[PDB]
Design a protein around this ligand. Structure first.
Ligand SMILES: CCCCCCCCCCCNC(=O)N1CCC(C)CC1
Ligand SMILES: CCCCCCCCCCCNC(=O)N1CCC(C)CC1
Lengths: 193, 193
C-alpha cells in the first residue's frame, strides 16, 4: 500500500533518468511496480501526479536537512556557515538529478508543481533573510540592501545556477565548481560594502 | 514586404501583451496585419516563427546597446560602470515584457529559441569575463574566482532575477528594486575578498 506507492515512485525516478515524463507511459510505471494499469490508477491519477509526489519528497528532504542545520548552534566561521547550507541544496537536488530535471520542466505545465516550488522558495528566502538579519544585529554584516531583497536574488541565483550545472546546460558553471562559485557570491554580497 | 513582416511582428507583440502564443491564432495575426491567412504563410511558417523573430529582435537590441556602451571609454566609477551595463538588459527586456515572457516560455518547447538564448548568454558572459579580467589586470579587482565562472553565475542570476521581477512572480525582487539589488551583488562579488 505504502509499498505499492513506493514502488511506483521508485520506477518513475528510475525511468526519468533515461527519458522525459512525456515518453514514460502508465503501462511502464505499472510494469516497473509489478501492478496492472488499473491498480496504478488506484494509487495515482496520472504520471504527472507521480512526478509531483517525487518532487515533493526531494523538496522536503532539502527542507528537513536545512531545518536540522538551523537547529544546531551556528558555525562560528561565516563562510563555512553559508557553504554548509548551500551544500544541502547542491547535494539534495544533485543526488536526484532526474527528479530535479523533470520537476523544473513541470513548473511550466503544472500549477501544483509551480506552487510547491514557490512555497518552498519563499520559506528558504525567509530563512536566508532571517540569518542575514541576525548577522547584521550581531555586527557581523553591514546594513546594505534590504535583507529580504538580497535573499531573494541570491536564492534565485542558486535556483538557476545549480540547475544549469546539474543539467550540463551551455552556459553553466561546471558542477565541480558551482558550490565555490555560489559561496563566494553569497559571502561577498552579505558581508561586503 | 519588409512592411508586411513588420505588421505581423507588431500584431504578435501587441496580442502577446493580452494572452499566450497558444491562444493567438494565425487568423488573429493575419487580421491584425491586414492580410489573409495564406499571405501570412508567405512571410512566416508558423506563429512560433513569428515569436522567434520578435525575440531575435529584442535580444539583438540589447546586444547592440551593450556594444555601444563597450565602444565608449569605461566609466571611471566601477559601480556606475556595471550599473549602466546591467541597465541595458533591465530596460531592453523590461520594455518588451510580452516578448520576454513568451520567449522565456518558448525556451522549453523550441530548439531555435533555446539556441538563440544560449548563444547570446555565452556572448554576454564572455564579455563580462573580459571586463572582470581587465579590472584584475589594472589592479582594480582581486584575483578570486575564475572570472568566466563568476561571470556565468552573475549572468544566470540576472537572467532568472530580472525575469521573475518583470513577470511579477512570487518570489521576486520588486521591479523598482531589482537594478540596485543586482548591482550590489555584482560589485561586491567582483571587487570583494
Ligand atoms: C524543481 C526545480 C529544480 C532546481 C532545484 C535546485 C535549486 C535549489 C535552490 C535552493 C535555493 N536556496 C538556497 O540555495 N539556499 C537557501 C538557504 C540556505 C541558508 C543556503 C542556500
Ligand atoms: C527570453 C528570456 C528572458 C529573460 C531575459 C532577461 C534576462 C537578461 C539577462 C542578461 C544577462 N546579462 C547581463 O545582465 N549583463 C551582462 C553584461 C553586462 C556588462 C551587464 C549585465
Amino acid at each position: 500500500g505504502d509499498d505499492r506507492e513506493l514502488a511506483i515512485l521508485a520506477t518513475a525516478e528510475n525511468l526519468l533518468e533515461d527519458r522525459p515524463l512525456a515518453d514514460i507511459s502508465v503501462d511502464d510505471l505499472a510494469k516497473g511496480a509489478g501492478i496492472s494499469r488499473p491498480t496504478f490508477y488506484f494509487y495515482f491519477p496520472s504520471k504527472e501526479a507521480v512526478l509531483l509526489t517525487l518532487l515533493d519528497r526531494v523538496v522536503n528532504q532539502a527542507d528537513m536537512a536545512l531545518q536540522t542545520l538551523a537547529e544546531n548552534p551556528a558555525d562560528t566561521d561565516r563562510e563555512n556557515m553559508w557553504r554548509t547550507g548551500i551544500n544541502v541544496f547542491f547535494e539534495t537536488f544533485g543526488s536526484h538529478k532526474a527528479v530535479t530535471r523533470a520537476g523544473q520542466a513541470a513548473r511550466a505545465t503544472s500549477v501544483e508543481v509551480a506552487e510547491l516550488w514557490s512555497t518552498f522558495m519563499q520559506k528558504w528566502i525567509a530563512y536566508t533573510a532571517a540569518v542575514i538579519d541576525a548577522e547584521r544585529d550581531r555586527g557581523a554584516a553591514p546594513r546594505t540592501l534590504p535583507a529580504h531583497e538580497l535573499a531573494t536574488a541570491l536564492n534565485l541565483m542558486n535556483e538557476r545556477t545549480l540547475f544549469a550545472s546539474f543539467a550540463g546546460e551551455q552556459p553553466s558553471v561546471p558542477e565541480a565548481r558551482v558550490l565555490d562559485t555560489l559561496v563566494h557570491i553569497w559571502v561577498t554580497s552579505i558581508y561586503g560594502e
